[PDB]
Design a protein around this ligand. Structure first.
Ligand SMILES: CCCCCCCC/C=C\CCCCCCCCCCCCCC(=O)N[C@@H](CO[C@@H]1O[C@H](CO)[C@H](O)[C@H](OS(=O)(=O)O)[C@H]1O)[C@H](O)/C=C/CCCCCCCCCCCCC
Ligand SMILES: CCCCCCCC/C=C\CCCCCCCCCCCCCC(=O)N[C@@H](CO[C@@H]1O[C@H](CO)[C@H](O)[C@H](OS(=O)(=O)O)[C@H]1O)[C@H](O)/C=C/CCCCCCCCCCCCC
Ligand SMILES: CCCCCC
Lengths: 198, 202
């Protein structure tokens, strides 16, 4: 469990990194090597933010410290630089995981094919990543969906019943959603969000 | 350039690793983020072979030493393990680069769609990797060719900064290919002789 947001809504870097380093394996529960590059991309971001943090933990104590310090340090290159860029991408993946799991927990599905995960992953993708992907990467997303597991199999890998698995997940989603929201609002407030497409 | 093959055809782990270290950036010359995971995968292999070798340059002096030693270390798990597995996959990416450049150089081409490299990448894929990829990854490869550059850009990017003609670029590549092609053929031969090749698919 991620720690809850303090009153001031600031996120301490070290403990954020520690918690989110546990999430790349989420993609291993999908059950196919097709999803390895996704895990590697999210891990990459985390590694890079950690590297910046470790150069000076006091100065980069919060995620906000990271953005404001880097903004001065890189001037006209910022925000397409350093840990600011890595976190800009990381939050999108983290949002995918949030929308995806929330959707599953809320019982969104295709009534004709309730044990697929297509409508949920497609929803998450739409809300988290689609806007930042060119048409070629979107066609790759579509191919990758044919590697998706059965919902029941994914929930089994995420592990002690299935009805509770969903409840553990709902409990996880509280502070996770709240933290991700704060990070997005931070990017918006600092005009650190970019829109280029891969 | 890669060191030449000696008489004994034993490939020295340290130089080889140093030479192939220059190759992952090849994929950056393709000009799209779509090829990044391929860069990362080949780099991964190189790094893993280095981590095993660094533990004892002497015991792992040769590529053939890696296979011999690991065979003993890991028993029934081998060859699906360590640097042997890493190089099993590395060789396939290296052969992709071999076949693809070789093709380009030799011509080939389509010319109902004249200056797209779909045909050269495709030959290279078929001959090096397709057999080890299941239908989803192959479908992914198909979508990824849409991101492939035109020929000239590619060559432009390969020599980038040095100031060369297309013709000059090509012959530089041809020169490179001699100890590279020879070296990759020897690695493939070693895997066959040591019964270290696996055929599982991704
Ligand atoms: C069903 C489940 C599927 C859900 C998948 C949704 C999540 C995937 C999203 C990954 C995030 C993303 O879109 N990344 C994108 C942008 O990355 C960012 O790029 C930035 C530069 O512009 C930075 O480099 C950044 O890293 S940093 O640390 O240096 O700052 C890095 O995170 C990234 O390009 C996408 C990664 C997913 C892989 C997609 C492409 C795979 C194509 C492979 C083609 C293989 C060719 C043939 C195969 C035989
Ligand atoms: C034109 C250019 C076309 C490129 C053609 C060459 C493609 C080369 C691909 C690399 C070779 C390959 O197929 N690798 C494969 C096997 O890797 C090996 O797997 C082993 C485990 O069985 C080991 O982990 C091994 O690493 S080791 O160091 O631990 O031993 C590792 O190298 C690897 O799975 C393929 C990597 C290329 C990307 C494949 C598909 C990515 C699709 C991602 C979809 C993302 C969907 C989200 C869209 C936003
Ligand atoms: C480099 C991408 C810019 C997006 C902001 C409008």
């Amino acid at each position: 469990l991620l720690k809850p947001l303090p009153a001031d809504k600031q996120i301490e870097t070290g403990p954020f990194l520690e918690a989110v380093s546990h999430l790349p394996p989420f993609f291993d529960c999908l059950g196919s090597p097709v999803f390895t590059p996704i895990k590697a991309d999210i891990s990459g971001n985390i590694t890079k933010i950690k590297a910046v943090y470790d150069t000076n933990p006091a100065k980069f104590r919060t995620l906000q410290n990271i953005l404001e310090v880097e903004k001065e340090m890189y001037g006209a290159e910022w925000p397409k630089v350093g840990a600011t860029l890595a976190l800009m991408w990381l939050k999108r993946g983290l949002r995918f995981i949030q929308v995806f799991l929330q959707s599953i927990c809320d019982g969104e599905r295709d009534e004709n094919h309730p044990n697929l995960i297509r409508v949920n992953a497609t929803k998450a993708y739409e809300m988290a990543l689609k806007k930042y992907h060119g048409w070629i990467v979107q066609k790759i997303f579509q191919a990758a969906l044919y590697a998706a597991p059965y919902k029941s199999d994914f929930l089994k890998a995420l592990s002690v019943t299935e009805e509770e698995c969903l409840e553990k997940i709902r409990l996880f989603l509280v502070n996770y959603t709240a933290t991700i929201d704060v990070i997005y609002e931070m990017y918006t407030q600092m005009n650190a969000e970019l829109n280029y497409k891969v």
